[PDB]
């Protein structure tokens, strides 16, 4: 339903690679789920993504959790994006 699923997935792969000194190549998202929290000011969303990535050639699945703080009264700046979990399956 989100129009930033593929983007958040790439962010996940990137952030994993960054943190874990890896070089996974993002292929695509196979499953996505949302946990949307409308708060008094910001919106917070936990994204649960199952993505395909290539690990020095071979295609593997990874489940990623991405945490997103986003505002609907002023663009960016106090927005935020964070990989919480990223594990092979």
């Amino acid at each position: 339903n989100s129009l930033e699923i593929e983007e958040l997935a790439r962010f996940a792969v990137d952030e994993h690679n960054k943190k874990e000194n890896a070089l996974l190549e993002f292929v695509r998202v196979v499953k996505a789920k949302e946990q949307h929290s409308i708060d008094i000011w910001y919106d917070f969303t936990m994204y649960y993504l199952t993505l395909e990535a290539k690990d020095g050639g071979k295609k593997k699945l990874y489940e990623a959790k991405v945490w997103v703080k986003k505002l609907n009264n002023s663009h960016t700046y106090k927005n935020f994006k964070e990989l919480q979990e990223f594990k092979p399956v």
Partner: protein, 166 residues
């Protein structure tokens, strides 16, 4: 019988002062602005013995599992501004938006509160607040956490609003 209420508004409008005046019946000058917590008080409203469960919100910049629960299960909302701070009055529109959004509903029990009406001066015109409240289709009540002015009326009006929508 419980009424779950949520008190919202920019920091420094007197959310805590209002809440503590209704619960403990005294004015607290300097309440830690970071402290968010729920408080319960049994009261009588229009001959009804009932329990009010009130979340005094604080720290809107960080996610709160507590606030999350009360946004979902809260029955009514006090949107508070300060009558001597225009910014707090402007923030009201976004608070209301987020409450409508979380309930997916225009028709959420809600009372607009103009706090600090004890002060001899004011910056936000009364008629402006009345005009806004009317546009939203909600009650507007002027309060003073310092003098206790309109505090009972603020929370009870909300309970009456919640009663209407049941």
């Amino acid at each position: 019988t419980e009424y779950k209420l949520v008190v919202v508004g920019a920091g420094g409008v007197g959310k805590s002062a209002l809440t503590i005046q209704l619960i403990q019946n005294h004015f607290v000058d300097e309440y830690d602005p970071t402290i968010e917590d729920s408080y319960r008080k049994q009261v009588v409203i229009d001959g009804e013995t009932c329990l009010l469960d009130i979340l005094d919100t604080a720290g809107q910049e960080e996610y709160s599992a507590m606030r999350d629960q009360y946004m979902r299960t809260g029955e009514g909302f006090l949107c508070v501004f300060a009558i001597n701070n225009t910014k707090s009055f402007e923030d009201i529109h976004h608070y209301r938006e987020q409450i409508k959004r979380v309930k997916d509903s225009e028709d959420v029990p809600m009372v607009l509160v103009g706090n600090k009406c004890d002060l001899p001066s004011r910056t936000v015109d009364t008629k402006q607040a009345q005009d806004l409240a009317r546009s939203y289709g909600i009650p507007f009540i002027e309060t003073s956490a310092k003098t206790r002015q309109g505090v009972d009326d603020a929370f009870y009006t909300l309970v009456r609003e919640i009663r209407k929508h049941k």
